Amino acid sequence: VEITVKELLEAGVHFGHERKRWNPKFARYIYAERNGIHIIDLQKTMEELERTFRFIEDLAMRGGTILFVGTKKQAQDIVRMEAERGMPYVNQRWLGGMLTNFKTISQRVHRLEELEALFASPEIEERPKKEQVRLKHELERLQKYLSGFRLLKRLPDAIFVVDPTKEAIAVREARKLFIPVIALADTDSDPDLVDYIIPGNDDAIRSIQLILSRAVDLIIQARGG
RNA sequence: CCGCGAGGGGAGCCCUAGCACAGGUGCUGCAUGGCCGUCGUCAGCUCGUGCCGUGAGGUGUUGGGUUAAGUCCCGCAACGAGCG
Numbered sequence: 490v491e492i493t494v495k496e497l498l499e500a501g502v503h504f505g506h507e508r509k510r511w512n513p514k515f516a517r518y519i520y521a522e523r524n525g526i527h528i529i530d531l532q533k534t535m536e537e538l539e540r541t542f543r544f545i546e547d548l549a550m551r552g553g554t555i556l557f558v559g560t561k562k563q564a565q566d567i568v569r570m571e572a573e574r575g576m577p578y579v580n581q582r583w584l585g586g587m588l589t590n591f592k593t594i595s596q597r598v599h600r601l602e603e604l605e606a607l608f609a610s611p612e613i614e615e616r617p618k619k620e621q622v623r624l625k626h627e628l629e630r631l632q633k634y635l636s637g638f639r640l641l642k643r644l645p646d647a648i649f650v651v652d653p654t655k656e657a658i659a660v661r662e663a664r665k666l667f668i669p670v671i672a673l674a675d676t677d678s679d680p681d682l683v684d685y686i687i688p689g690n691d692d693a694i695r696s697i698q699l700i701l702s703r704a705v706d707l708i709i710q711a712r713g714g
Numbered sequence: 715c716c717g718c719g720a721g722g723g724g725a726g727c728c729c730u731a732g733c734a735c736a737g738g739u740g741c742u743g744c745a746u747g748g749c750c751g752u753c754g755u756c757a758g759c760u761c762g763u764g765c766c767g768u769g770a771g772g773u774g775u776u777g778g779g780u781u782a783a784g785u786c787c788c789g790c791a792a793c794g795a796g797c798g
C-alpha cells in the first residue's frame with residue numbers, strides 16, 4: 490500500500506485555494522496558477538508524502554499514539570472514522586489547553602468516566618429529577634467534546650492535523666511541547682510550522698478521504714496486521 | 715479539735731480600725747469584639763492551571779440568543795472551581 494500520482498489527481502488533491510488567501514512561504518510547493526487558483530505540484534506532494542509516511546510508520550511501529558485533528562465541517566466524519574480504525578482524534582472543538590494544559594483538561598475525562606459510572610448505577614434515581622436531567626446534560630456535553638480525547642492517557646507522540654492554518658492553536662501547542670506536527674496543508678499555510686508535511690487539498694472530502702485512509706492504512710499495516 | 719474541768723485553740727459568719735480592692739450608663743464606635751443598617755435578593759465578586767502581554771493587567775466573566783438570575787444555549791484560548 491503506497492499511493493499513485495494518478496489517484497491523487499482524482500482526489501483533486503492539487504486544487505489549491507484562490508490566489509487571494511495565500512502564503513508565499515508555500516510557493517515552494519506550487520506548479521502554477523490556472524484561473525485564479527494555485528495548483529499544487531504533485532511531483533512534490535508525492536515525495537513529501539513519502540518522507541512523511543515513513544515517519545508515521547516507524548512511529549506506529551514503535552507504539553506511538555498520533556492525535557488526529559480536524560475541526561472543519563468537511564473533515565469531521567472523516568477524521569473520526571479514520572482515527573477509530575486505532576488512535577484518538579479531536580473533531581468537535583479544539584479546547585485550548587488540551588495539550589499544554591493537558592492535566593486540567595483530562596481532569597474533565599475522569600468526570601465523565603464518573604458520570605458514566607453514575608448512570609449505570611442505582612444511586613442516580615436518588616437525585617431530584619432536576620439535578621438528574623442537569624447531570625445528564627453535563628455528561629452529554631462531555632461526550633460530545635471528549636469522545637476521542639478520552640483515549641489519550643498521556644500527550645501524543647505526534648499530532649496529525651487537517652488544515653494547519655485553521656488549527657494553528659492545536660499546532661502552536663504541539664510545537665511548544667516539542668511534539669511533532671503532521672498536516673495536510675493547502676496554500677494558505679505556513680509550511681514552516683509543519684514538521685512532517687503533505688501539501689494538497691485540505692478542503693474536499695475526496696482529498697482528505699484519500700490521505701487519511703492511506704495514513705491509517707499504513708498505521709495498522711505496521712502494527713502487525 | 716485538745717481537756718476530767720475551769721477553759722485555750724479553730725471553721726464559718728458579724729462589727730470596728732487599717733490595706734489590697736470593689737463600683738462608675740465618665741470619655742474615646744476615629745483604639746476594638748459581637749451584632750445590625752446599607753448599596754442590594756442587586757447578580758454580581760473572585761481563584762487554580764493554560765494562554766496573551768516587557769509590564770500594571772487581560773483572558774475565562776466577553777459576544778449573539780435566553781433568563782428573576784454569571785439561568786441556560788451557541789460561540790470562543792480556554793478548562794474548571796470557590797463565594798453568590
Ligand SMILES: [Mg+2]
Pocket residue numbers: 652654655675677691
Ligand atoms: Mg483552509
Ligand SMILES: [Mg+2]
Pocket residue numbers: none
Ligand atoms: Mg469531749
Ligand SMILES: [Mg+2]
Pocket residue numbers: none
Ligand atoms: Mg464548751
Ligand SMILES: [Mg+2]
Pocket residue numbers: none
Ligand atoms: Mg469598669
Ligand SMILES: [Mg+2]
Pocket residue numbers: 743
Ligand atoms: Mg464604625
Ligand SMILES: [Mg+2]
Pocket residue numbers: none
Ligand atoms: Mg455617633
Ligand SMILES: [Mg+2]
Pocket residue numbers: none
Ligand atoms: Mg510571560
Ligand SMILES: [Mg+2]
Pocket residue numbers: 775
Ligand atoms: Mg464581571
Ligand SMILES: [Mg+2]
Pocket residue numbers: 755782783
Ligand atoms: Mg435574584
Ligand SMILES: [Mg+2]
Pocket residue numbers: 784
Ligand atoms: Mg452560577
